[PDB]
Design a protein around this ligand. Structure first.
Ligand SMILES: *[C@@H]1O[C@H](CO)[C@@H](O[C@@H]2O[C@H](CO)[C@@H](O[C@@H]3O[C@H](CO)[C@@H](O)[C@H](O)[C@@H]3O)[C@H](O)[C@H]2NC(C)=O)[C@H](O)[C@H]1NC(C)=O
Ligand SMILES: *[C@@H]1O[C@H](CO)[C@@H](O[C@@H]2O[C@H](CO)[C@@H](O)[C@H](O)[C@H]2NC(C)=O)[C@H](O)[C@H]1NC(C)=O
Ligand SMILES: *[C@@H]1O[C@H](CO)[C@@H](O)[C@H](O)[C@H]1NC(C)=O
Ligand SMILES: *[C@@H]1O[C@H](CO)[C@@H](O)[C@H](O)[C@H]1NC(C)=O
Ligand SMILES: *[C@@H]1O[C@H](CO)[C@@H](O)[C@H](O)[C@H]1NC(C)=O
Lengths: 542, 224, 216
């Protein structure tokens, strides 16, 4: 949304903060910064991320310091939404302040999750007691207890906090967007009714009152409707928020939402799923428990086991885009493998690897991966150096079997070059046993199999000891040097090593014909050109 | 005006700036000669059409020992100098036979001297022209005696060297079977050619592109 | 199909009529639209009426298999590259036909292999050239005797001309020069192919009055 209609460049189209500012500054990413100076010169007030408006009620009154580097997700409840001296006036604890930002001291005291829920300050005496309360008993839900009668400072409300302790269960913000099965009472609220926090309090207290609720789901649709359901005995949670599951393609039947935004599922982390007896309570224990899979039903010979010694953990650095699907262990035990391999079969692309482990036996993790082979540029047809890179050590990993179709899909063209700098090899298949006219066809099939295959090198990898025919799968072609255009006259670019032998007709680097759209998504880390060993400053006449 | 020659059209064009191997210091060019020392020179601004080029010229560089009264009628020994030769004024040319003998330093013995003209930013391996010419008795007060090859240097982007050589009885006298054998001027030309073969790479030139030149009877003694 | 008629046969030659482009187009109108040029020849890029899929044809209609992709293609392969790639996919003749700088067949070609193991067929030349580096005819007969170069000239599609030019050349006579160069990566780029082509054209010089294979 440019100001004018001209819009000469992309630098001239302007962010939402940087569009309109009246004493407002914007970060390097273009939105509002956290802190903003008040009336020009003055104090600092720290505003909302998407709207310029301040959360006033937090710290509109203290003419005090800057740097609100603690997220005020709290909300000072208006006095019309609190009663006084109700018949349970117990505060879990308080602390004497140091008379130096007492409110910020108590807000830092409830950075940790446990049983906090709201504050009550006490300004009658110079000591300012932050008597805070708990997630327990005490649309349109107010604060239902307070201790002191005569005077009335405000009370707060921590909103949307991740972890929670509500005196019977231990709630956690499980990042999985959607749920498969098991739900008593999905109830809707009016679009003008709640503000996604009153609903949070309502469903949390509803589960905390009831028994054996493993968790609860809530969501707000962009049409204003707010839906709250209360989970118990889920089969498997699927489609986490931080996965590559969207293919930038039209949704098929229903994949993640199942209702077509905001959506979350919370689980009691210390649940008694298996330990719960069936007969007592009878609280919808009748999850269907489908029939056992016979051996002839699916062969599962499309997968091969991989010894974990070749796997290397690089969790702090790796960005292999991938998906978690989390089982619940109530009924799936050792048949999570067969189910997740069948789901790997169901997702036709983007399941070159399947991984199965368990965290604490309430979860049962299966993660879907693309091919995470990282090959060194040593260029040898042994392929033993190609070692996987994964975030965490698996317990049971499986590789999908590669399939080669009858005919090629692309008319691959021979590059006129003989030497590459930035080489990102994916596979190093040795094809010495076969002949040339069929080995090259198999290598073309191999590159047609992989989605991110942009080229293939078909060459004699070691010429010191005879020769070894090989097929290298090239994720990214690099600096292509040593052409035949100059015809051997004045070559200042050094040509290839004499043991490579990429010259003669069947052999010699082929490029997949250039897909005009893009290379597809989820491909490994965005390919970098070979880094310049010097810094090339601009002392060149342009 | 000079434009760039390119094989194909392009949208970004970068060129590293030209460099000169001539260390300027207070606007007199200087060159280190490897075995001997330093050369101090001269700088000139030259107009062709309405455009101007700076050429560094080194008039008076020697290449052999002077033949005065003992080395007459003998092969040229090398001149083994050390320090900083002042190459800022022309020296004398050799004794041509037809000479009016006007009182002047234009003609005399001790005439084995070069004249090296180098444009400002030459090609990195520039060609070398070697012109052999003994000038007639002309007043060298207007510097460059009768051949300022600097214009050919500036227009053609190349290094010009104009030399002098013994001619006449001093150049060619033969008597007896040995040691007054002759061809002394030819040996002087060979000595100048070996000098420009050896030391020209510090000037910016390329010693594999040397082109010999002479004229008007000197070409008779150059095609040998 | 050649068995049809426009429906109105006139005496003498017709003034002009629609080509196979326009016949197929009128058939489809009376989907996908076959785009044609001004002349009667399918354009080397054929796209659907919605610009989502484009491929390459060879002026007769059938689609080159690899060229199907989203959007517009660049460097559309021509008939020589298609045939030469097909010979690496199992088509019978294992000797690659001689090809120009672009994807076009040389006017003069050489199957180059006869009487392989005393029986007359074509040796597997695309496999043959690689492991044994031959640059010299004497060394070639030392490595492979009884193989004589069978050269001819070809059509526009590369069909061999009937009963004409099917010549055989003996490798024994020539003594080799220029044996100090690197391998040129393709037999068509080897100087032996120019030796065969110059010998073949010199033989056909006295024939036909012309120092070439005849044109269209
Ligand atoms: C690139 O690598 C391939 C790997 O197969 C090389 O092929 C091999 O090449 C050698 C040397 O020409 C062949 O040895 C030959 O064996 C025959 C058997 O009778 C013998 O008579 C010869 O004297 C020679 O020793 C070998 O058979 C062949 N292997 C195959 C075809 O499987 C190829 O040569 C390498 N490229 C280059 C240009 O050398
Ligand atoms: C949801 O949020 C809105 C806006 O934050 C709340 O609206 C407030 O309503 C009271 C009622 O008189 C006003 O005095 C306040 O000024 C309003 N707030 C603002 C920021 O203008 C609303 O009460 C919230 N709760 C619901 C709908 O249950
Ligand atoms: C889902 O919908 C698609 C149409 O978009 C259809 O092809 C398919 O048969 C449906 N069912 C399944 C199980 O994919
Ligand atoms: C100059 O000195 C060098 C030093 O080796 C010597 O070879 C040469 O003969 C000397 N020349 C004269 C004329 O003394
Ligand atoms: C022309 O020939 C093709 C291939 O044989 C055939 O598919 C098509 O139907 C024919 N056209 C007719 C019969 O009009």
């Amino acid at each position: 949304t440019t100001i004018s209609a001209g819009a000469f460049s992309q630098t001239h189209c302007v962010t939402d903060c940087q569009r309109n500012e009246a004493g407002l500054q914007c970060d390097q990413n273009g939105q509002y910064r956290a802190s903003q100076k008040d009336r020009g010169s003055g104090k600092a007030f720290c505003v909302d991320g998407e709207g310029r408006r301040l959360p006033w009620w937090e710290t509109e009154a203290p003419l005090e310091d800057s740097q609100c580097l603690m997220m005020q997700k709290f909300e000072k409840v208006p006095e019309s939404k609190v009663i006084f001296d109700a018949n349970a006036p117990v505060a879990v604890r308080s602390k004497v302040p140091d008379s130096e930002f007492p409110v910020m001291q108590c807000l830092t005291d409830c950075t940790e999750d446990e049983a906090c829920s709201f504050f009550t300050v006490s300004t009658t005496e110079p000591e300012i007691s932050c008597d805070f309360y708990a997630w327990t008993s005490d649309l349109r839900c107010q604060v239902k207890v307070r201790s002191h009668g005569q005077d009335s400072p405000a009370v707060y409300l921590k909103k949307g906090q991740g972890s929670t302790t509500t005196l019977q269960k231990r709630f956690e913000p499980t990042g999985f967007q959607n749920m498969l099965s098991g739900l008593y009472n999905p109830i809707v609220f009016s679009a003008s009714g709640a503000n996604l926090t009153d609903a949070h309090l309502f469903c949390l207290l509803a589960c905390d009152r009831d028994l054996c609720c493993d968790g609860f789901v809530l969501t707000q649709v962009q049409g204003g409707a707010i839906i709250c359901g209360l989970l118990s005995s889920p089969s498997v949670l699927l489609c986490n928020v931080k996965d590559w599951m969207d293919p930038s393609e039209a949704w098929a039947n229903a994949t993640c939402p199942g209702v077509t935004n905001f959506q979350q599922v919370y689980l009691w982390k210390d649940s008694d799923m298996g330990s719960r007896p069936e007969s007592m309570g009878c609280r919808k224990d009748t999850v269907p428990r489908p029939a056992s899979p016979t051996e002839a039903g699916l062969t599962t010979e499309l997968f091969s086991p991989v010894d974990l010694n070749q796997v290397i953990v690089n969790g702090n650095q790796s960005l292999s885009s991938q998906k978690h699907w989390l089982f619940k262990h109530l009924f799936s035990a050792q048949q999570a493998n067969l189910w997740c391999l069948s789901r790997c079969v169901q997702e036709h692309s983007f399941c070159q690897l399947a991984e199965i482990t368990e965290s604490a036996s309430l979860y049962f993790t299966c993660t879907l991966y693309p091919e995470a082979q990282v090959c060194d540029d040593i260029m040898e047809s042994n392929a033993q150096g190609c070692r996987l890179i994964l975030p965490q050590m698996p317990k049971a990993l499986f590789r999908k079997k590669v399939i080669l179709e009858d005919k090629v899909k692309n008319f691959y063209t021979r590059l006129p070059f003989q030497k590459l700098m930035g080489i990102s090899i994916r596979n190093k298949v040795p094809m010495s046993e076969k002949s040339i006219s069929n080995g090259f066809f198999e290598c073309e099939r191999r590159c047609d199999a992989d989605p991110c295959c942009t080229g293939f090198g078909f060459l004699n990898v070691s010429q010191l000891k005879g020769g070894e025919v090989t097929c290298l799968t090239l994720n990214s072609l690099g600096i292509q040097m040593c052409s035949e255009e100059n015809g051997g006259a004045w070559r200042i670019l050094d040509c290839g090593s004499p043991d490579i032998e990429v010259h003669t007709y069947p052999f010699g680097w082929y490029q997949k014909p250039i897909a005009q759209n893009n290379a597809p998504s989820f491909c490994p880390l965005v390919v970098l050109p070979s880094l310049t060993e010097k810094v090339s400053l601009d002392s060149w006449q342009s | 005006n000079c434009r760039l020659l390119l094989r194909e059209e392009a949208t970004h064009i970068y060129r590293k700036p030209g460099i000169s191997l001539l260390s300027y210091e207070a606007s007199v060019p200087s060159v280190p000669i490897s075995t001997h020392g330093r050369l101090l020179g001269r700088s000139q601004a030259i107009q062709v059409g309405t455009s101007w080029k700076q050429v560094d010229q080194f008039l008076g560089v020697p290449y052999a020992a002077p033949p005065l009264a003992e080395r007459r009628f003998q092969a040229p020994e090398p001149l083994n100098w050390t320090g900083s030769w002042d190459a800022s004024k022309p020296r004398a040319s050799c004794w041509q036979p037809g000479t009016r003998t006007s009182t002047s330093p234009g003609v005399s013995e001790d005439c084995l001297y070069l004249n090296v003209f180098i444009p400002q930013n030459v090609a990195p391996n520039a060609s070398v022209l070697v012109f052999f010419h003994n000038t007639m008795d002309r007043e060298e007060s207007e510097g460059w005696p009768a051949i300022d090859g600097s214009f050919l240097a500036a227009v053609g982007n190349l290094i010009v060297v104009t030399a002098s050589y013994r001619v006449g009885v001093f150049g060619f006298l033969s008597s007896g079977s040995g040691e007054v054998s002759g061809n002394w001027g030819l040996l002087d030309q060979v000595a100048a050619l070996t000098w420009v073969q050896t030391h020209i790479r510090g000037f910016g030139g390329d010693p594999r592109r040397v082109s010999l030149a002479a004229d008007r009877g000197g070409a008779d003694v150059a095609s040998i | 199909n050649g068995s049809e008629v426009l429906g109105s046969r006139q005496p003498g030659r017709p003034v002009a009529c629609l080509s196979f482009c326009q016949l197929q187009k009128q058939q489809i109108l009376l989907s996908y639209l076959p785009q044609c040029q001004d002349s009667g020849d399918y354009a080397p890029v054929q796209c659907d009426v919605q610009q989502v899929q484009c491929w390459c044809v060879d002026a007769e209609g059938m689609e080159v298999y690899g060229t199907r992709q989203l959007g517009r293609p660049k460097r559309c392969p021509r008939s020589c590259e298609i045939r030469n790639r097909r010979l690496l996919h199992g088509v019978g003749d294992k000797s690659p036909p001689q090809c120009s700088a672009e994807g076009e067949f040389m006017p003069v070609q050489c199957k180059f292999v006869n009487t392989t193991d005393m029986m007359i067929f074509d040796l597997v030349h695309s496999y043959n050239r690689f492991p044994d580096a031959f640059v010299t005819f004497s060394s070639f007969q030392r490595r492979f005797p009884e193989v004589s170069g069978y050269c001819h000239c070809a059509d526009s599609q590369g069909r061999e001309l009937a009963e004409t030019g099917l010549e055989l050349l003996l490798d024994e006579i020539y003594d080799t020069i220029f044996a100090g160069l690197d391998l040129p990566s393709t037999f068509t780029e080897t100087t032996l192919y120019r030796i065969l082509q110059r010998r073949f054209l010199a033989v056909q010089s006295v024939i036909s009055g012309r120092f070439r294979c005849p044109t269209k």
